[PDB]
């Protein structure tokens, strides 16, 4: 119930690390009064507002480890967003991002990035995006990705990768290189063929996940899906399969 002045001023004297301003109809963070003096907060929630942009002032909030802009209307981020040296959790889902800013992968600490439900594609990603090697959870579901960059293989600490409901015509073979991968959601795309190198992953355990429904798979994979998870990885490690892949890529 408190107004935007009491939540700014009480988090400075009572010394609260965690500000919540979720669902407060803010259109603009410079209107939140003295918000950017709060240079010792570690968590800033602004989901469910009406933000159209994040201002360069985000950079003074030096010690943010959690920054949640979920379900706003942001068309653009400031390059300063990558200077948050303590930042680990960044949530940008349900926004209107079709681009990311210069040097976004410069985040030295980031561990969970969530870009779900935007207008992102491969061209939206800046060049240094995969210097984000601290990342272990990357959610890109509901976007317009037609190809995933080969450099996905450099996110070696990745345990979770969601590409649900994108436009992917193919998986990059480098996904085999993500040893620590636990969850892989690729439901909803235009995949017809898994890359054989993906068999290097064992996602058949119970604390692991591999969803892939609603994809125009080729009939021999479709039928290993009916049989269960492990029967697809077996069949893609297959050598009968390998002769399929190469004669498919050229067809």
């Amino acid at each position: 119930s408190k107004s935007l002045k009491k939540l700014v001023e009480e988090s400075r004297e009572k010394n609260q690390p965690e500000v919540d301003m979720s669902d407060r109809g803010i259109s603009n963070m410079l209107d939140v009064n003295g918000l950017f003096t709060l240079s010792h907060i570690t968590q800033l929630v602004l989901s469910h507002n009406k933000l159209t942009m994040v201002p360069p002032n985000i950079a003074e909030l030096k010690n943010l480890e959690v920054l949640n802009f979920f379900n706003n209307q942001i068309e653009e981020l400031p390059t300063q967003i990558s200077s948050l040296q303590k930042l680990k959790h960044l949530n940008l889902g349900m926004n209107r991002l079709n681009t990311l800013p210069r040097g976004f992968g410069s985040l030295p600490a980031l561990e969970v990035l969530d870009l779900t439900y935007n207008n992102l594609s491969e061209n939206s990603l800046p060049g240094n995006f995969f210097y984000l090697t601290t990342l272990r959870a990357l959610y890109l579901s509901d976007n317009d990705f037609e190809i995933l960059p080969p450099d996905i293989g450099k996110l070696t600490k990745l345990q979770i990768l969601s590409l649900r409901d994108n436009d992917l015509i193919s998986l990059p073979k480098e996904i085999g290189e993500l040893t620590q991968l636990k969850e892989l959601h690729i439901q909803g795309n235009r995949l017809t063929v898994l890359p054989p190198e993906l068999g290097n992953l064992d996602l058949t355990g119970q604390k692991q996940v591999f969803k892939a429904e609603n994809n125009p798979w080729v009939t021999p994979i479709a039928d290993q899906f009916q049989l269960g998870v492990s029967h697809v990885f077996e069949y893609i490690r297959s050598e009968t399969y390998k002769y399929l892949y190469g004669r498919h890529m050229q067809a």
Binding site: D20, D23, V45, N68, Y139, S141, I160, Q187, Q206, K207
Partner: protein, 131 residues
């Protein structure tokens, strides 16, 4: 007097291996999954029990999906992932949750019921035919 072992519940006549308030026999101060004892090796307590090194991890070694340090104390298990009781929360408004709250699996993240209500109808319609 003579102290009384904590396992066989007989009194001890030889070496009295004091540990965890109770007194023990040399061969009965053991690990709680594999049977064998320590014999002077070091113990790892947990709520009255004790384990060796290479088993103490396999149980009490779940790691908090939020803060990534290994969970000491109560272990919230949900959605094929694990949380510290104070780390578990809504993934979209970061207010704290318990397994007794109503929440929704969204790409295996927890979403509080109030937050799910604000999702685009396009999206909610499609997720009810997924998993």
């Amino acid at each position: 007097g003579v102290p009384i072992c904590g396992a066989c519940r007989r009194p001890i006549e030889g070496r009295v291996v004091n540990a965890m308030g109770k007194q023990w026999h040399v061969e009965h101060f053991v690990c709680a999954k594999c049977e064998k004892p320590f014999l002077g090796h070091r113990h790892y307590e947990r709520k009255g029990l004790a384990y060796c090194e290479t088993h103490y991890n396999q149980l009490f070694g779940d790691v908090c999906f939020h803060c990534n340090r290994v969970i000491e104390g109560d272990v919230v298990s949900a959605l094929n992932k694990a949380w510290c009781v104070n780390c578990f929360a809504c993934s979209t408004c970061n207010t704290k949750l318990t397994l007794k709250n109503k929440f929704v699996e969204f790409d295996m993240k927890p979403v509080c019921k109030k937050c799910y209500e604000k999702f685009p109808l396009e999206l909610k319609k499609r997720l009810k035919k997924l998993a």
